[PDB]
Scaffold this active site. Structure first.
Site, mmCIF file in Angstrom:
data_model
loop_
_atom_site.group_PDB
_atom_site.id
_atom_site.type_symbol
_atom_site.label_atom_id
_atom_site.label_comp_id
_atom_site.label_asym_id
_atom_site.label_seq_id
_atom_site.Cartn_x
_atom_site.Cartn_y
_atom_site.Cartn_z
ATOM 1 N N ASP A 236 0.839 -1.196 0.000
ATOM 2 C CA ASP A 236 0.000 0.000 0.000
ATOM 3 C C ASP A 236 0.879 1.253 0.000
ATOM 4 O O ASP A 236 1.789 1.381 0.811
ATOM 5 C CB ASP A 236 -0.897 0.035 1.229
ATOM 6 C CG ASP A 236 -2.180 0.806 1.014
ATOM 7 O OD1 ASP A 236 -2.082 1.938 0.535
ATOM 8 O OD2 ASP A 236 -3.261 0.176 1.183
ATOM 9 N N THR B 192 -7.118 3.612 -2.058
ATOM 10 C CA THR B 192 -6.819 2.206 -1.836
ATOM 11 C C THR B 192 -7.875 1.215 -2.373
ATOM 12 O O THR B 192 -7.548 0.298 -3.132
ATOM 13 C CB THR B 192 -6.552 1.908 -0.365
ATOM 14 O OG1 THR B 192 -5.418 2.622 0.098
ATOM 15 C CG2 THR B 192 -6.238 0.453 -0.117
ATOM 16 N N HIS C 189 1.623 8.724 5.373
ATOM 17 C CA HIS C 189 0.636 9.707 5.790
ATOM 18 C C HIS C 189 1.184 10.546 6.955
ATOM 19 O O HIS C 189 0.958 11.756 6.989
ATOM 20 C CB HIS C 189 -0.684 9.058 6.234
ATOM 21 C CG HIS C 189 -1.586 8.643 5.136
ATOM 22 N ND1 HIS C 189 -2.378 9.548 4.504
ATOM 23 C CD2 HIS C 189 -1.814 7.476 4.524
ATOM 24 C CE1 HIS C 189 -3.068 8.911 3.553
ATOM 25 N NE2 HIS C 189 -2.708 7.669 3.532
#
Ligand SMILES: *[C@@H]1O[C@H](CO)[C@@H](O[C@@H]2O[C@H](CO)[C@@H](O[C@@H]3O[C@H](CO[C@H]4O[C@H](CO[C@H]5O[C@H](CO)[C@@H](O)[C@H](O)[C@@H]5O)[C@@H](O)[C@H](O[C@H]5O[C@H](CO)[C@@H](O)[C@H](O)[C@@H]5O[C@H]5O[C@H](CO)[C@@H](O)[C@H](O)[C@@H]5O)[C@@H]4O)[C@@H](O)[C@H](O[C@H]4O[C@H](CO)[C@@H](O)[C@H](O)[C@@H]4O[C@H]4O[C@H](CO)[C@@H](O)[C@H](O)[C@@H]4O)[C@@H]3O)[C@H](O)[C@H]2NC(C)=O)[C@H](O)[C@H]1NC(C)=O
Ligand SMILES: O=C(CCc1ccc(OC(F)(F)F)cc1)N1C[C@@H]2CN(C(=O)c3ccc4[nH]nnc4c3)C[C@H]2C1
Ligand SMILES: [Ca+2]
Ligand SMILES: [Zn+2]
Ligand SMILES: [Zn+2]
Length: 804
Positions: A121, A159, A265
């Site tokens: 991811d 995502t 993030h």
């Protein structure tokens, strides 16, 4: 209800799902609050960690250990991944030199190389190069197998839309997962990360790889992993599944890592804290590959290392607030962040008007970092419109920014330095692809491609027939050593008419005029040859496009251009012309400014007329083959035929003229000639597919002349630009656009300036694949080249992105 009184003894990570209320032992059971009482004890052991050490070698088997170093552990399939290194003198996979895998080397009982998909991811493409020093295992996969410099995600670059696109080969608009958050008005239900609605099967369209495999009798591991299950345990479970007996063993598997997205993030894409998560991933890859070596499967399994999207630098202070634009901010609902979606707060307020919302959001601040659109006006390359879950009003946010409703939404909900979701042509959102194994090529680089293409290849790797999807099957055959799928061109459905001179001038009553009464076998047998297609090999370089639906059309030949003229839509479907590097731009002579001329090959009743453009005060007209590029004064008259005319809004004519008078010549200079194919597109229902005649929503007033939603051009030249476009021996090079036919230039905030400052920027934003144009027109291009069909399919999926 779950009566969780059953036991997971002998069932840990079972593959079948046992139905309610009996308790479960599969890798999803946590997420459903349904595990048996003893799942953690038996199925999530942690004792003594994940590595063998010297002193465990040949221990007495003890079943409480998370993994084993006992002599029976290979038989049982449950050794620690480093067992042979520590206890049997072997080397780590990563320390072995790579050697070509020319044929699979599988153990007895393997019917086919298994596929393992290792998904990560938030793995930005530039990590492969910038992190390569701390990622030795990943770097060996990349350098030894097949890799792209990057893979293009879908929009939005979130995502769930991207992971479900990977699994199905479909655009989000078609699979239904159009965001991490959604409202469906028909269901009147909301999808969210927090809550139980996202489990209901009705959100999830199309047919993902694990269903495709199952229906065709190929067994699949379960793809989903509950966040509390640690990576080491995910890897060991895959390896345990690989030692199952032949009749029970899956052929396809997925691992998933939340990293490096999670850290990205918090710290930004290249924050110093990001080295550690990249090390950790590499170590996990290292465990998998060592585990495959132990099972004798490291020259048998095909492995795909793949990301969902990248990551960009984004902070709280770079937020635009709708409250600084709209008066009535409380009458809307906004889905926020790296994209904006707006709808009415209440279905019972008929003082809601999208036109006024759009207008209050359009070019209001000099630096404005978002741009509003009705969804049907979004660039067609995003394929982001044809679903009831996509709100009509969309905000495209600039990279590095957020949009929110009011400031209190930001501080009372900085905390973050990274985010993703932006336009999928942005370099920061690009992600990775590597394939390693017997079916993939050896030390091969391939060009960047779109993640919509992978489902087909995963189906090929497994001997499956793909469900209908948005990939172009065959476009990625150059990644594979074998298992290619050998596509054939579609059959032409309509054949053209070849009209000669059939009408006298006076039979026409079009209200057109032209000053052409200005007047010899020398120059006359010669222009006759031009009308039978004597110059057609100069202007039609890759064969006529094929029409793949039933319709009635004429091929028209001319000195400088060739067209396929639709008797139903009363204009060309396509117009083809070649502009050499030496060609000269001319102007429209003064006597010919309003010249339109009847075409004596085509009947009055299947022609446009000038009276309708006179009476329609909103609509004007342009030409597909441009008069500015005529080869001679006499040839120029061909460019004013009524059969070369198309309806254009005066605002769109600014864009069109500048493209025809300035840019075509510029491209010809730069690329050593260009072949151009131009024409119209009708997509009133914004489904990315050609509209039928009975679906046209707008006509030139008082007429049956239909108004295009969009105009396209495909611009082709020689990849080796030392050769001219018209004498090219090898691979081609292409770029294309699908421009919206709009009555204003509100999209372009600098449009009151000279076209030289805004036109090309609009065109780059509306860059397109030839394939996109195929779907929108029902035409099939490049039918007659000397290139292999696989290569041509690759060319038709290429997108020129103008990122540096
Ligand atoms: C990208 O690739 C995709 C996939 O190839 C392309 O999408 C396909 O495009 C087709 C044309 O737009 C479309 O065909 C439809 O199909 C209608 C019935 O479809 C239902 O069944 C689908 C198949 O599932 C089964 O799969 C296997 C077989 O493969 C079976 O073994 C299983 O049993 C499965 O059930 C199913 O996928 C589809 O699902 C959609 O809706 C679900 C719930 O609402 C969602 O979960 C899911 O996400 C799907 O949603 C997308 O697609 C729908 C459109 O179907 C769209 O509305 C959504 O926004 C979303 O984007 C279905 O449940 C069939 O009824 C259609 O036929 C009408 O038109 C013909 C034209 O020839 C008429 O002649 C005919 O009479 C009929 O008209 C009637 O209806 C009219 C309108 O309602 C009415 O006015 C008229 O009077 C008549 O009553 C048509 O053939 C495919 O379904 C679609 N597939 C997918 C997966 O999206 C896509 O085009 C590509 N994109 C680009 C740009 O190229
Ligand atoms: O277990 C899986 C996927 C299995 C899979 C693998 C390959 C796969 O692809 C393929 F099919 F091709 F293999 C499909 C499914 N998931 C569980 C995860 C929970 N998540 C987030 O909490 C989350 C994460 C990043 C974010 N950034 N911003 N918000 C975010 C929210 C995302 C999830 C997906
Ligand atoms: Ca359409
Ligand atoms: Zn993600
Ligand atoms: Zn994320």
């Amino acid at each position: 209800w779950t009566a969780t009184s059953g036991s997971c003894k002998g069932r840990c990570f079972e593959l079948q799902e046992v139905g309610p209320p009996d308790c479960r032992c599969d890798n999803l059971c946590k997420s459903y609050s349904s595990c048996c009482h003893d799942f953690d004890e038996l199925c999530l052991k942690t004792a003594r960690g994940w590595e063998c050490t010297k002193d465990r070698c040949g221990e007495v088997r003890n079943e409480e250990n998370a993994c084993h170093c006992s002599e029976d552990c290979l038989s049982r399939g449950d050794c620690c991944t480093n067992y042979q290194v520590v206890c049997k003198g072997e080397s780590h996979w990563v320390d072995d030199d790579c050697e070509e895998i020319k044929v699979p080397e599988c153990p007895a009982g393997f019917v086919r190389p298994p596929l393992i998909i290792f998904s990560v991811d938030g793995f930005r493409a530039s990590y492969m190069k910038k992190g390569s020093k701390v990622m030795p295992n990943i770097e060996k996969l990349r350098s030894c197998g097949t890799h792209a410099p990057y893979m293009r995600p879908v929009y939005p670059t979130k995502t769930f839309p991207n992971l479900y696109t990977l699994a199905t080969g479909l655009y989000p608009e078609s699979h239904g997962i159009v965001g991490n958050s959604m409202y469906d008005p028909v269901f009147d239900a909301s999808f969210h990360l927090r809550g139980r609605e996202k489990f209901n099967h009705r959100w999830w369209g199309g047919q993902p790889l694990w269903i495709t495999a199952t229906k065709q009798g190929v067994r699949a591991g379960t793809f989903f992993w509950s966040v509390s299950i640690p990576h080491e345990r995910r890897i060991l479970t895959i390896l345990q599944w690989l030692s199952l007996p032949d009749n029970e063993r899956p052929s396809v598997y997925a691992f998933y890592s939340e990293q490096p997205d999670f850290s990205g993030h918090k710290y930004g894409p290249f924050g110093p804290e990001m080295t550690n998560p990249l090390r950790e991933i590499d170590k996990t890859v290292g465990q998998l590959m060592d585990g495959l070596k132990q099972l004798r499967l490291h020259r048998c399994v095909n492995v795909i290392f793949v990301g969902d999207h990248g990551m960009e630098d984004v902070t709280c202070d770079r937020t635009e607030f709708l409250s600084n634009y709209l008066t009535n901010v409380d009458d809307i609902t906004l889905v926020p962040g790296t994209l904006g979606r707006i709808r009415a707060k209440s279905i019972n307020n008929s003082k809601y008007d999208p036109k006024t919302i759009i207008a209050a959001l359009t070019c209001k601040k000099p630096d404005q970092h978002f741009k509003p659109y009705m969804k049907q006006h979004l660039p067609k390359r995003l394929h982001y419109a044809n679903n009831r879950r996509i709100e009509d009003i969309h905000l495209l946010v600039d990279r590095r920014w957020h949009v929110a409703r009011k400031p209190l939404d930001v501080y009372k909900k900085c905390f973050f330095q990274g985010d993703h979701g932006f336009d999928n042509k942005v370099n920061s959102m690009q992600t990775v692809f590597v394939g390693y194994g017997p079916t993939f090529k050896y030390r091969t680089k391939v060009p960047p491609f779109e993640n919509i293409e992978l489902y087909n290849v995963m189906c090929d790797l497994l001997g499956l027939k793909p469900a209908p999807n948005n990939g172009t099957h065959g476009s990625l055959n150059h990644l594979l050593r074998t298992n290619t799928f050998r596509p054939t061109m579609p059959d032409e459905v309509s054949r053209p008419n070849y009209p000669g001179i059939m009408y006298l001038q006076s039979e026409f009553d079009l209200g057109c005029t032209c000053d052409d009464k200005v007047e010899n076998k020398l120059e006359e047998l010669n222009k006759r040859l031009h009308t039978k297609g004597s110059t057609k090999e100069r202007h039609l370089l890759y064969g006529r496009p094929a029409v793949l639906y039933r319709t009635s059309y004429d091929i028209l030949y001319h000195t400088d251009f060739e067209s396929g003229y639709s008797e139903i839509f009363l204009m060309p479907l396509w117009t083809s012309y070649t502009i050499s590097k030496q060609a000269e731009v001319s102007s429209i002579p003064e006597h010919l400014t309003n010249c339109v001329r009847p075409d004596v090959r085509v009947s009055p009743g299947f022609s446009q007329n000038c009276l309708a453009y006179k009476n329609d005060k909103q609509m004007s007209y342009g030409f597909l083959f441009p008069p500015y590029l005529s080869s001679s004064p006499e040839a120029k008259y061909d460019a004013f035929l009524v059969t070369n005319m198309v309806p254009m809004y005066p605002a769109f004519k600014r864009v069109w003229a500048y493209f025809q008078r300035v840019l075509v010549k510029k491209y010809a200079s730069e690329r050593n000639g260009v072949n151009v194919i131009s024409g119209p597109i009708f997509d009133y229902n914004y489904d990315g597919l050609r509209d039928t005649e009975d679906e046209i929503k707008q006509y030139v007033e008082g007429s049956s002349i239909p108004v295009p939603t969009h105009y396209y051009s495909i611009i082709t030249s020689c990849l080796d630009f030392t050769q001219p476009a018209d004498k090219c021996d090898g691979p081609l090079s292409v770029s294309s656009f699908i421009l919206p036919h709009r009555p204003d230039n509100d999209e372009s905030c600098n449009s009151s300036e000279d076209e030289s400052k805004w036109v090309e920027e609009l065109m780059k934003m509306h860059t397109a694949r030839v394939r996109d144009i195929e779907h929108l027109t029902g035409l099939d291009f490049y039918r007659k080249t000397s290139r292999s069909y696989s290569e041509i399919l690759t060319l038709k999926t290429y997108l020129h992105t103008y990122e540096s």
